Amino acid sequence: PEMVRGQVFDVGPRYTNLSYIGEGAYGMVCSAYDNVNKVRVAIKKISPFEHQTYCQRTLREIKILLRFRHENIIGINDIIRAPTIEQMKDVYIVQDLMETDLYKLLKTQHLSNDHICYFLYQILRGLKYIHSANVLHRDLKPSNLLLNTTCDLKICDFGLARVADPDHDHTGFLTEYVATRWYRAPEIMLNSKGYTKSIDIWSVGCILAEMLSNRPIFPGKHYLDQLNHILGILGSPSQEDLNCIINLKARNYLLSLPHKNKVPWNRLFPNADSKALDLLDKMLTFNPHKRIEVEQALAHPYLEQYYDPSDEPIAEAPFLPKEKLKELIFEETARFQP
Numbered sequence: 438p439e440m441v442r443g444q445v446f447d448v449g450p451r452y453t454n455l456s457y458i459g460e461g462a463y464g465m466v467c468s469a470y471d472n473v474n475k476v477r478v479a480i481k482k483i484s485p486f487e488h489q490t491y492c493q494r495t496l497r498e499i500k501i502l503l504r505f506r507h508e509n510i511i512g513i514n515d516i517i518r519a520p521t522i523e524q525m526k527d528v529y530i531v532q533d534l535m536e537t538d539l540y541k542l543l544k545t546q547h548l549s550n551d552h553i554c555y556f557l558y559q560i561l562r563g564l565k566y567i568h569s570a571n572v573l574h575r576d577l578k579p580s581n582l583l584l585n586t587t588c589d590l591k592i593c594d595f596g597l598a599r600v601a602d603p604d605h606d607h608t609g610f611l612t613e614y615v616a617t618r619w620y621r622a623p624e625i626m627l628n629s630k631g632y633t634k635s636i637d638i639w640s641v642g643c644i645l646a647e648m649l650s651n652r653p654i655f656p657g658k659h660y661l662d663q664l665n666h667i668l669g670i671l672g673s674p675s676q677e678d679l680n681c682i683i684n685l686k687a688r689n690y691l692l693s694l695p696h697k698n699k700v701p702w703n704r705l706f707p708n709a710d711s712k713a714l715d716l717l718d719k720m721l722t723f724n725p726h727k728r729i730e731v732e733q734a735l736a737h738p739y740l741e742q743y744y745d746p747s748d749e750p751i752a753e754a755p756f757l758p759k760e761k762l763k764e765l766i767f768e769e770t771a772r773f774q775p
């Protein structure tokens with residue numbers, strides 16, 4: 438039984454020569470030589486079985502990623518676990534090894550306009566597929582966008598994903614939310630559960646802005662401070678957009694704020710391509726009903742050199758206590774067993 442950083446990393450004889458990568462949500466991450474395909478691979482250890490939430494998220498991701506097949510979405514290549522429920526304490530998910538991710542790249546590398554364009558294209562191409570399956574990722578951020586040595590990009594981490602449910606999207610003001618703060622659309626803090634596709638487009642807009650400067654655009658330090666970062670750049674919502682927020686606590690909060698003017702994108706991003714800023718503006722639209730959709734974003738002039746809807750595939754179809762969820766993780770991973 439191989440050990441890494443003083444813990445069992447029990448990946449069998451198939452996978453050998455482990456090197457520590459980093460530290461996931463529910464366990465450790467390593468590379469390993471795959472003795473069957475003769476390539477190094479990434480493997481993450483997942484120990485979710487005590488907690489119903491870690492079980493829920495583990496199972497959501499497994500079910501989604503096994504059903505999806507797309508060049509810009511990470512696959513599951515193998516899953517390692519014990520032969521019986523009783524002996525299964527952990528699950529190992531094997532995926533393609535990727536050199537880096539966008540978070541690491543942004544902290545260390547200047548991106549050319551050509552790189553930004555290509556990364557954005559790949560993100561949206563992957564997102565077209567996800568949305569075509571009626572699924573929302575709900576936690577798009579640089580550290581969930583993996584890149585290889587030739588800058589192929591794959592979206593990962595579907596633990597917070599949901600089926601879209603726009604008829605149940607409304608909630609009150611200051612309703613708590615789980616997904617990463619800096620990439621949360623303004624409506625999350627006002628009146629949205631994050632059950633519509635527009636939530637993901639906002640996050641992509643934040644990612645685009647961060648590619649342009651290497652700095653997150655709206656780095657809020659706490660729940661409501663996130664909204665006030667957004668409003669500091671977008672400025673005060675218009676009457677029409679304010680009138681769409683029927684909830685009085687949310688509406689009156691916005692009305693209580695002093696008038697803020699829009700910060701022009703070309704002053705925030707003086708070296709950016711003008712077509713990139715036109716698309717950014719459309720993704721970072723305050724009103725989620727007016728926000729650009731994924732397929733429109735692909736068709737935007739900024740992406741013209743890549744846009745090819747015949748080569749931007751869609752999914753073939755649309756997509757509980759911890760004891761039942763352990764059984765379900767066991768069943769879902771059975772296809773990888775001898």
Ligand SMILES: CC(=O)NCc1ccc2[nH]ncc2c1
Binds near residue numbers: 532533
């Ligand atoms: C967000 C996440 O789950 N990161 C860990 C991870 C997953 C797959 C990976 N492939 N290559 C490297 C690598 C890292």
